[PDB]
Amino acid sequence: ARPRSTRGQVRLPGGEFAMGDAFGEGYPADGETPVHTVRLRPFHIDETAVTNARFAAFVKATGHVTDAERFGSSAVFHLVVAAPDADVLGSAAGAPWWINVRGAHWRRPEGARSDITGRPNHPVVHVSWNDATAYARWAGKRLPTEAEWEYAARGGLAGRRYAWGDELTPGGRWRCNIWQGRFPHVNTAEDGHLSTAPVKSYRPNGHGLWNTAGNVWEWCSDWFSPTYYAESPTVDPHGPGTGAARVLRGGSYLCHDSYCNRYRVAARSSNTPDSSSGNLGFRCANDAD
Ligand SMILES: [Ca+2]
Ligand SMILES: [Cu+2]
Ligand SMILES: [Cu+2]
Ligand SMILES: [Cu+2]
Ligand SMILES: [Cu+2]
């Protein structure tokens, strides 16, 4: 436990909120219901997802090798692949818009022919749950619990669909980075961004958190279970004791209503802890006092 650091974090009061899909419109397999009352002690949470600049200081200081560098490849969205054809290990099965690209990792997130020199303030991607919790440890932080993330993401509002309210595009304007157009072939970039956006795009929510909806998925501490909500403690729920996949929240720049609207503040997803991809990052937290 390195010397605790609240740099770039806001302190949120905590208290009691209604966690879950207040509209019963979610995906049944994800267990967004029942809406259940949770009580959180005050905590800190990152204002933004972790940046390339910050994650790079972590690697410079610890020589950490990310799971995507060990496995040898990470998933890249097919429209933005920037690699020699030798490196394309072919479409991922079950979702052919994801190309397994050899050499694709956080420093070269579209493949061997890309860099992140122009994107220090973009969220870091190609980071697994292991890479995420490693960084947090080194940085004097931890990952948020799922409940901490949703409460922080709701921004002091109760029972809303999104971090800012219930209209997806208030005033007919975009305030988050997801997908527009015909997925997976055409992205019209109405929201300003094809792939990742800078961490402080648009505007923060009620608690000061930028881009909890969209941009990239965000690792949480919990194991995923679609029945945790109906069995949850009331105080500081940490998730079930074991599981198959760790929780992801927020959605990403690929989310679209046609197949995955998980940018809803109550939507949930998961993935195996050593998974990485070009739309998956994280933000840290910490206890208070
Ligand atoms: Ca977009
Ligand atoms: Cu390490
Ligand atoms: Cu296409
Ligand atoms: Cu952009
Ligand atoms: Cu989605």
Curated annotation (Swiss-Prot):
Changing residue 255 to S: Abolished formylglycine-generating enzyme activity. One of its GO terms (biological process) is protein oxidation. It catalyses: L-cysteinyl-[sulfatase] + 2 a thiol + O2 = an organic disulfide + 3-oxo-L-alanyl-[sulfatase] + hydrogen sulfide + H2O + H(+). Its cofactor is Cu(2+). GO terms for molecular function: calcium ion binding; cupric ion binding; formylglycine-generating oxidase activity. Its EC number is 1.8.3.7. Gene3D superfamilies: paralog of FGE (formylglycine-generating enzyme). Belongs to the sulfatase-modifying factor family. Ca(2+) binds at residues 177-178, 191, 193. This is Formylglycine-generating enzyme. It comes from the Bacteria. Pathway: Protein modification; sulfatase oxidation. Oxidase that catalyzes the conversion of cysteine to 3-oxoalanine on target proteins. 3-oxoalanine modification, which is also named formylglycine (fGly), occurs in the maturation of arylsulfatases and some alkaline phosphatases that use the hydrated form of 3-oxoalanine as a catalytic nucleophile. Keywords: Calcium, Copper, Metal-binding, Oxidoreductase. The catalytic copper is required to activate oxygen and catalyze oxidative C-H activation.
